[PDB]
Amino acid sequence: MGRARDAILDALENLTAEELKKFKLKLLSVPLREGYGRIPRGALLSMDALDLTDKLVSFYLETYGAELTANVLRDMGLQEMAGQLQAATHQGLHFIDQHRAALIARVTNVEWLLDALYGKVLTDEQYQAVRAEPTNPSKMRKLFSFTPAWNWTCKDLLLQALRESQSYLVEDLER
Amino acid sequence: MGRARDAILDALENLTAEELKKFKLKLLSVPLREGYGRIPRGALLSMDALDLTDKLVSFYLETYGAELTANVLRDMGLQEMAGQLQAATHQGLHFIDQHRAALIARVTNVEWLLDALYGKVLTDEQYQAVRAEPTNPSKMRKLFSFTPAWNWTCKDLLLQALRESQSYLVEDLER
Amino acid sequence: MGRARDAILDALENLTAEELKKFKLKLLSVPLREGYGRIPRGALLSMDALDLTDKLVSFYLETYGAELTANVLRDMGLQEMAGQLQAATHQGLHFIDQHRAALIARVTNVEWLLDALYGKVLTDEQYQAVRAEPTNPSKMRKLFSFTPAWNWTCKDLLLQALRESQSYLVEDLER
Amino acid sequence: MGRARDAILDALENLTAEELKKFKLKLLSVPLREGYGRIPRGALLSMDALDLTDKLVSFYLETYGAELTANVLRDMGLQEMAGQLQAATHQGLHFIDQHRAALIARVTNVEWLLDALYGKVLTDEQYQAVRAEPTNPSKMRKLFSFTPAWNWTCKDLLLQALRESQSYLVEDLER
Amino acid sequence: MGRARDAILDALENLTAEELKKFKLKLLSVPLREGYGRIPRGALLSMDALDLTDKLVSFYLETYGAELTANVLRDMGLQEMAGQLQAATHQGLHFIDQHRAALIARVTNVEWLLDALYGKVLTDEQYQAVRAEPTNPSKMRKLFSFTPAWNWTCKDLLLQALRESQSYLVEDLER
Amino acid sequence: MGRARDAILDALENLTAEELKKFKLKLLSVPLREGYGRIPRGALLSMDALDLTDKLVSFYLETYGAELTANVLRDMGLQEMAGQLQAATHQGLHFIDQHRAALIARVTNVEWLLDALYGKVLTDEQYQAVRAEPTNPSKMRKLFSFTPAWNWTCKDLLLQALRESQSYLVEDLER
Lengths: 175, 175, 175, 175, 175, 175
Known about the structure:
Chain A contains 13 helices and no strands.
């Protein structure tokens, strides 16, 4: 699966000239994996977004180019663009999606997650339906039913709530 | 659910230049969650409300951006603006809406709440109708019937009255 | 229900500058409820009534702002403006309106109240009409029919007469 | 029917730079119909009114572009520009024009409308001529004879008067 | 530990306009530690509190900036603001907290301290409880149990009483 | 080890436009080491922060470029920027880290350092733990255990406290 060129272009088109200049400047000093070259200063300091996109795709592979662009954007502080690019490249698959079974089987403090997600994402009837479940696995199974209608931001909020509540569980899942 | 940019813009546009400058100054030293950067002084000390809103949504996501804006505003002392922002981001969902079932089940001192809400919120006929109910759960069920016509301020007043009357119930519900 | 800005402006606009200075000075040491900030001295000691009203509504909500203004006015000794603001915020609803049924059902010495209210509030015709009633509940029901034409001061006088006559009933009703 | 470019240009050219920037900012979060894209931030935050008109007509069709511009303008609170744009796009056709026969046939309280329109729109001679009519349909037919000389604002005032007088008729006609 | 920006802003914001000018004037002649520059007259004589705080933090670090501000405020005579800034910078840690063990072990005349603190700080029942202790170390240990509920002013009063009673013990303590 | 370009950019992005012109002007007269040229006035007086950073890295190497930038910044009086740049360039290595063994072996007046660091950096428990140590080397070994959690400012505070306490040891160690 490829077609990440359009994702990179979309990420690069939602930032102004003063941010594009900073991105190009920071591209000159970012650490690189072995076997990959560096773009010369002569051409890099004059390209626009359109030329930068296919230059990035040519010099670094599509996957590595996408992840390098995400890392550079995250370093500059632009979290929205990095999140959008990560969502585009990784499809509609999030961290909670890969570890779904472990999250339904090992989480304990459901009420903290419900309180964190109440109002911002969950509606009143959904909150009551989730709270009506007897046991924690049942609550988790009911809660995950609303995930397909969510976007990247809501999933990130849920992950942040889980990290704040149970750091040990998420650290174990990372390993 | 998004649309937090409009809420942030409304919150930031309703405060004067002297408060905006203090807000920008306090944005430089507010504690930040891990993984988030800080706005440089060069650009921050010259932005207006629109640019500040755009940069706030850019560096921090809509959820965390709104939360940070509310925290900074309530640190400045502007409680009205923070309350309006919380109402906008959370929709018409309040603390009393979340724990409605427990509140119509565990509260005892209803006449104190009625005295606190008399005149300012409740009318004479509504007060008489609530007083006509035989038991406390019936009184609470009748009282919650008028909630949809209320705004954030009335719900905050009711929460304050509940906290003053039965602090233990409130601290148990929040925890 | 809001509209407290107009009430606060009317209360603060009906006092002279020398006692406006005293109001501003006493606003610096009044005890505050939990979770509310304090106005800095640099700006507070230089504003007029128009700016003071806006900042009072800004830092403290309309409800708590009106309550704090009434408390500060009562502490200064100005009962007239404090009572006017109390009437404005609580609408045309008084203590006697809240406990009308209990007052009609439990009061005994109506003659003392009639003597206290004679001339100052009631004319000869109303006095004779009330005296013509056979029993105490009938006298109270006849008397309460004249309340809609009264103002805050007459109701306060009636409450004072009730407190002087039957203090135990008043302290029971308030608690 | 087209020519929406001139209407959009006239609407956008009659507003200052500071609210132009607000319009551009709010164009980034307005809900969109399915099948329509969003203008990237890179170009949107730099173009002026002349470029913005062409961009709006390109990305969105003339009809939907005008509708979206009017919706955003009403969201900002500027009702004069939105009304002018509606008048330009819909030609000299108003709500009262489309439902003329039903309005002449079903309205009852003509005198309230005449009182609302007196002085602001109708002259003394026209008012007397309308009052001289025997029955309500005759009064309405006489009143509608002066409509061609009116503008959008007068028709909006008449519609507001009708809505305030007979709300049920208006809500029936609109549905 | 940082966050001295908030403390400096609070200290500068609670002082009036005619004495902010005196503060700025005295900032031009205060002795400076080696390696630190002096703010030029051109910009200093036009700033308000918001720019002054940022300039102070930029030119002198947070620690030295807070110390210099406290020294200048003390020279001006404003002891309350200097004490507030000192409390904010050093956290809730006072001189008595630093030498707690030495104070409990070496002080003799507890009665003078109790007489100085009676009424103003200590209540009757806890004064009696302290007086009930058999020996001086027990009296001091019981007295220090009420310290956490005190503020900076009470601790300053206790230190002043200690200086008046046993000057030699203090001057040994700081040196 | 390089990566000084990012540190230089971060230092240059945290100063306003008024200070950027002063920095560029100071760059035209700063003494230079042998073999290094001077930036011409034609291009220097028109660059922004990004172009200035690139040109500084181009003409002067990363090491000498960072050193010259720090020297110019501390000449201007902005000690915070110079300190942050020194911390970024030299990594988390300070003067105290370089002479750790000599400082633990040759210092005498630990109490002055503890008094200087009390409250601002050290907490009460840490202060008591350090005071509990019998001898000076043990006290210093305990004190250095808390160093990894500190930042550049705390280390500078400790360094200036040492310099004030006994300057002879500092001037011996630096030479």
